[PDB]
């Protein structure tokens, strides 16, 4: 339920990454959490790059 | 000349997401941890002229000290002030039982000043009491709030692990070597980019480093307090790395 609802424990580090929705996530863990959630899988969300989108 | 835990600029002490912008240099032990490329990704706490305390996951990208730059005495994140120090890491020391805490050796011992002072360390296995108001500081994510780009502070009550581990809160994840802190209604919390920074609690005279910013479920959500490494469960290891080095 928590994984599906996008509730995950993540370090509070700033190491931004870029999702296929063109949104910057503040670290890989946060993106990994949305990817595996219902709403992320809903949108076929994936990681596109290992830096902030556009930076 | 100076002593730990005693800011020469009186903190603001607000009633980082939420909180406020700190009075410049009222948290003189706050460090900004940057890569060689020189951009802020983690906080840290100065323990002594040469040593820094931070979170282990701040280091899990490169095992090499040359890849790290500790910024002392700063208030602005990008346009560093002219007095600010920029010292390069010489050694890294990971906590041996895979806990989220680590030590950094400074190549040139930073010079103590009215704006660069270390924090005091708790006594071993001290347990911060439930509802104790402490402060967390850093440059991390702000979510909808103000002060992005400047050092922020937030005053937050400790929640005893017993309550924090209840199902409606963090559901058994926290355990003994960590502490919780935050408001039940949410809205005030550390966040991404604050990792490895200090959680300090005032004790009579001075501030004591009691937590290292570590993890959480999101940031500032209701019923989801932040989780910090319990510094008192590790002081016997910190001193030895300074002592035996
Ligand atoms: Na500072
Ligand atoms: Na920020
Ligand atoms: Na606690």
- Method of determination is X-ray
Q: What sign does the dihedral B9-B29-B212-A30 (CA atoms) show?
A: positive
User: Two tokens at B105?
Assistant: 């050796």
Q: Using an 8 Å CB-CB cutoff, list chain A residues near B213.
A: 12
Give the Cα separation of B17 and B221 in Å (integer).
Answer: 10
User: Two tokens at B204?
Assistant: 């009579």
CA–CA min distance A25, chain B (Å): 10
Candidate from B192, B218, B227 with C-beta closest to A13: B192
Give the Cα separation of B117 and A9 in Å (integer).
Answer: 33
Q: Which of A1, A13, A29 to mutate to test the interface with B (most CBs of B within 10 A)?
A: A13
Q: Do A12 and B40 touch (CB under 8 A)?
A: no
Within 10 Å of residue B208's Cβ, how many Cβ atoms?
Answer: 24
Residue entry with tokens 């949108």 = A43
Q: Using an 8 Å CB-CB cutoff, list chain A residues near B173.
A: 9
Q: What is the largest CA-CA distance in chain A?
A: 34
Candidate from A9, A14, A26 with C-beta closest to B215: A9
Domains and CATH numbers, chain B: 29-118+234-243 (2.40.10.10), 133-232 (2.40.10.10)
Taking the domains of chain A in order of start, what are their residue ranges?
1-55
Within 10 Å of residue A8's Cβ, how many Cβ atoms?
Answer: 17
What are the residues whose beta carbons fall under 8 Å from the beta carbon of B73, sequence distance 6 or more? Answer: B25, B28, B81, B83, B84, B85, B113, B115, B116
Using the mean position of ligand 2's atoms as its centre, give its distance from the Cα of residue B152 in Å. 9
The β-bridge partners of A9 are B217
Contact A48, A20 (CB under 8 A): yes
Q: Which of residues 22-51 of A touch B (CB under 8 A)?
A: 26-27, 30
Comparing alpha-carbon positions, the chain B residue that sits nearest to A15 is: B41
Q: What is the 3 state secondary structure string of B182-219?
A: CCCCCCCECCCCCCCCEEEEEECCEEEEEEEEEEEECC
Contact B56, B71 (CB under 8 A): no
Of B86, B103, B85, residue with least CA distance to B94: B103
Contact B231, B177 (CB under 8 A): no
Comparing alpha-carbon positions, the chain A residue that sits nearest to B59 is: A13
Active site residues of B: 57, 100, 195
Q: Do A13 and B193 touch (CB under 8 A)?
A: yes
Using the mean position of ligand 3's atoms as its centre, give its distance from the Cα of residue B111 in Å. 34
For residue B69, the surrounding DSSP H or E stretch is strand B68-72
Deposited resolution, Å: 2.0
CA–CA min distance A13, chain B (Å): 5
């Amino acid at each position: 339920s928590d994984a599906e609802r996008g509730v995950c424990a993540c370090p509070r580090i700033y190491m931004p990454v870029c999702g296929s929705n063109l949104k910057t996530y503040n670290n890989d863990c946060l993106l990994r959490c949305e990817i595996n959630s219902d709403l992320g899988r809903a949108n076929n969300l994936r990681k596109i790059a290992d830096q902030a989108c556009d930076n | 000349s100076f002593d730990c835990g005693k800011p020469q600029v009186e903190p603001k002490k607000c009633p980082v997401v939420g909180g406020c912008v700190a009075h410049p240099h009222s948290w003189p032990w706050q460090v900004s941890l940057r890569t060689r490329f020189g951009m802020h990704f983690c906080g840290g706490t100065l323990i002594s002229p040469e040593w820094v305390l931070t979170a282990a996951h701040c280091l899990e990208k490169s095992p090499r000290p040359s890849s790290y730059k500790v910024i002392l005495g700063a208030h602005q994140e990008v346009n560093l002030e002219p007095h600010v120090q920029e010292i390069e890491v010489s050694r890294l020391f990971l906590e041996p039982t895979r806990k989220d805490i680590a030590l950094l050796k400074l190549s040139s011992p930073a010079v103590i000043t009215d704006k660069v002072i270390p924090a005091c360390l708790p006594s071993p296995n001290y347990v911060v009491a439930d509802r104790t108001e402490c402060f967390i500081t850093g440059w991390g994510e702000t979510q909808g709030t103000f002060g992005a780009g400047l050092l922020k502070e937030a005053q937050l009550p400790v929640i005893e692990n017993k309550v924090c581990n209840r199902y409606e809160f963090l559901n058994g994840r926290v355990q003994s070597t960590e502490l919780c802190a935050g408001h039940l209604a949410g809205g005030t919390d550390s966040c991404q980019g604050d990792s490895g920074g200090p959680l300090v609690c005032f004790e009579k005279d001075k501030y004591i480093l009691q937590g290292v910013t570590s993890w959480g479920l999101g940031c500032a959500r209701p019923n989801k307090p932040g989780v910090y490494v319990r510094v008192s469960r590790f002081v016997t290891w910190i001193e030895g790395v300074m002592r035996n080095n």
